Enzyme design. Structure first.
Site, PDB file in Angstrom:
ATOM      1  CG  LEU A   8      -2.055  -1.052   1.185  1.00 30.49           C
ATOM      2  CD1 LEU A   8      -2.876  -0.992   2.462  1.00 30.49           C
ATOM      3  CD2 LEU A   8      -2.949  -0.880  -0.031  1.00 30.49           C
ATOM      4  N   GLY A   9       2.048   1.191   0.562  1.00 26.96           N
ATOM      5  CA  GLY A   9       2.926   2.346   0.630  1.00 26.96           C
ATOM      6  C   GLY A   9       4.293   2.033   1.209  1.00 26.96           C
ATOM      7  N   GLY A  11       8.154   3.930   2.742  1.00 26.01           N
ATOM      8  CA  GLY A  11       8.906   5.096   3.178  1.00 26.01           C
ATOM      9  C   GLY A  11      10.228   4.743   3.842  1.00 26.01           C
ATOM     10  CB  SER A  14       7.231  -1.421   3.543  1.00 23.44           C
ATOM     11  OG  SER A  14       8.515  -0.956   3.157  1.00 23.44           O
ATOM     12  CD  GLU A  77      -9.718   1.446  12.057  1.00 22.87           C
ATOM     13  OE1 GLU A  77      -9.611   2.318  12.947  1.00 22.87           O
ATOM     14  OE2 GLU A  77     -10.815   1.150  11.527  1.00 22.87           O
ATOM     15  CG  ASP A 123       4.342  13.458   9.491  1.00 30.47           C
ATOM     16  OD1 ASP A 123       4.883  12.405   9.079  1.00 30.47           O
ATOM     17  OD2 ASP A 123       4.285  14.505   8.805  1.00 30.47           O
TER      18      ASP A 123
HETATM   19  C1  LIG Z   1      -1.750   3.619   3.146  1.00 34.29           C
HETATM   20  O1  LIG Z   1      -3.057   3.067   3.207  1.00 34.29           O
HETATM   21  C2  LIG Z   1      -3.454   2.596   4.434  1.00 34.29           C
HETATM   22  C3  LIG Z   1      -2.680   2.857   5.555  1.00 34.29           C
HETATM   23  C4  LIG Z   1      -3.047   2.396   6.825  1.00 34.29           C
HETATM   24  C5  LIG Z   1      -2.229   2.675   8.032  1.00 34.29           C
HETATM   25  C6  LIG Z   1      -0.991   3.215   8.188  1.00 34.29           C
HETATM   26  S1  LIG Z   1       0.163   3.543   6.849  1.00 34.29           S
HETATM   27  C7  LIG Z   1       1.420   4.200   7.997  1.00 34.29           C
HETATM   28  N1  LIG Z   1       2.621   4.646   7.498  1.00 34.29           N
HETATM   29  C8  LIG Z   1       3.005   4.661   6.127  1.00 34.29           C
HETATM   30  C9  LIG Z   1       2.518   5.613   5.213  1.00 34.29           C
HETATM   31  C10 LIG Z   1       2.929   5.595   3.886  1.00 34.29           C
HETATM   32  C11 LIG Z   1       3.826   4.645   3.416  1.00 34.29           C
HETATM   33  C12 LIG Z   1       4.325   3.694   4.292  1.00 34.29           C
HETATM   34  C13 LIG Z   1       3.913   3.714   5.618  1.00 34.29           C
HETATM   35 CL1  LIG Z   1       4.577   2.495   6.631  1.00 34.29          CL
HETATM   36  N2  LIG Z   1       1.038   4.190   9.255  1.00 34.29           N
HETATM   37  C14 LIG Z   1      -0.292   3.657   9.447  1.00 34.29           C
HETATM   38  O2  LIG Z   1      -0.749   3.599  10.567  1.00 34.29           O
HETATM   39  C15 LIG Z   1      -4.238   1.657   6.933  1.00 34.29           C
HETATM   40  C16 LIG Z   1      -5.028   1.383   5.816  1.00 34.29           C
HETATM   41  C17 LIG Z   1      -4.641   1.855   4.550  1.00 34.29           C
HETATM   42  O3  LIG Z   1      -5.405   1.598   3.445  1.00 34.29           O
END
Ligand SMILES: COc1cc(/C=C2\S/C(=N\c3ccccc3Cl)NC2=O)ccc1O
Length: 261
Positions: A8-9, A11, A14, A77, A123
């Site tokens: 999903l993302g 940085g 991951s 979640e 942030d």
């Molecule tokens: C990014 O989409 C979602 C994030 C989350 C929770 C997330 S994603 C996060 N950090 C990042 C943001 C961008 C890149 C990498 C990381 Cl590790 N921290 C969270 O709690 C849930 C459901 C989702 O559909």
């Protein structure tokens, strides 16, 4: 336990899409390398903060976590369907003030929650806000650069620079709430103009706000207020939510039917 899906993302670590085998619940699987974690509490501070804010759908819920040799794995979640505010604005452009009112209000309520639980997010930005498209509810995510809320001065910062207040840029010092209000100022501008007002340090230091979009005077006022150079001149969370532009906010469900469907 969990069934891993697509990334999903990447940085602050991951994050992957996921399904909980137990009940096919949609989850998010976050991976953080131990060598990159500078704040602990023995778990990373991010885990501590997330546990303090668990209850209320304005903040992301920590479902579980695991410790591995070199990484920590966070189970969070996952709303379905969902889109983050950055992508939402990026595809739809500047938001209507009614829609921006609803979103900004929900974010205020979310950060207010974090503060009551003694957590400072550090942030706040479009990328760290998820939108439950069906319920019209917003979630604050990524507590990875946040800290225990204190009334003394902070000398450390590892959040997004273009959302950081001028007292950070100049002196490497800020206080939690006024600094949060500043980032909220940047966020609200982002919502109504489709982009952030400052790019370089010198723009942040100067704090002269230009509106590239037709924005109402009251919204501009609130924005210029949150973006006061002097921290003490910034409004409190109460003062923001009593602002005339914040009157008559939509219910999250109305917001979806009108603006998301
Ligand atoms: C990014 O989409 C979602 C994030 C989350 C929770 C997330 S994603 C996060 N950090 C990042 C943001 C961008 C890149 C990498 C990381 Cl590790 N921290 C969270 O709690 C849930 C459901 C989702 O559909």
């Amino acid at each position: 336990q969990y069934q891993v899906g697509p990334l999903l993302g990447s940085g602050f670590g991951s994050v992957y899409s996921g399904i909980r085998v137990s009940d096919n619940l949609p989850v998010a699987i976050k991976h953080v390398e131990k060598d990159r974690i500078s704040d602990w509490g023995r778990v990373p501070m991010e885990v501590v903060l997330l546990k303090k804010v668990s209850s209320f759908s304005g903040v992301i819920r920590l479902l579980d976590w695991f410790e591995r040799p070199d990484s920590f794995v966070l189970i969070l979640e996952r709303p379905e369907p969902v889109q983050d505010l950055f992508d939402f604005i990026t595809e739809r452009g500047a938001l209507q003030e009614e829609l921006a009112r609803s979103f900004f209000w929900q974010v205020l309520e979310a950060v207010r929650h974090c503060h009551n639980c003694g957590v400072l997010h550090r942030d706040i930005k479009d990328e760290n806000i998820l939108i439950d498209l069906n319920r019209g509810e917003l979630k604050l995510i990524d507590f990875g650069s946040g800290a225990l809320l204190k009334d003394t001065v902070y000398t450390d910062f590892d959040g997004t620079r273009v959302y950081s207040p001028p007292e950070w840029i100049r002196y490497h010092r800020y206080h939690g709430r006024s600094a949060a209000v500043w980032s909220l100022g940047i966020l609200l501008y982002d919502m109504v103009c489709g982009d952030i007002p400052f790019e370089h340090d010198e723009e942040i230091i100067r704090g002269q706000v230009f509106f590239r979009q037709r924005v109402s005077s009251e919204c501009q006022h609130l924005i210029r207020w949150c973006l006061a150079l002097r921290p003490s001149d910034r409004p409190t969370f109460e003062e923001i939510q009593n602002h005339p532009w914040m009157q008559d906010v939509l219910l999250p469900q109305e917001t979806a039917e009108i603006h998301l469907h």
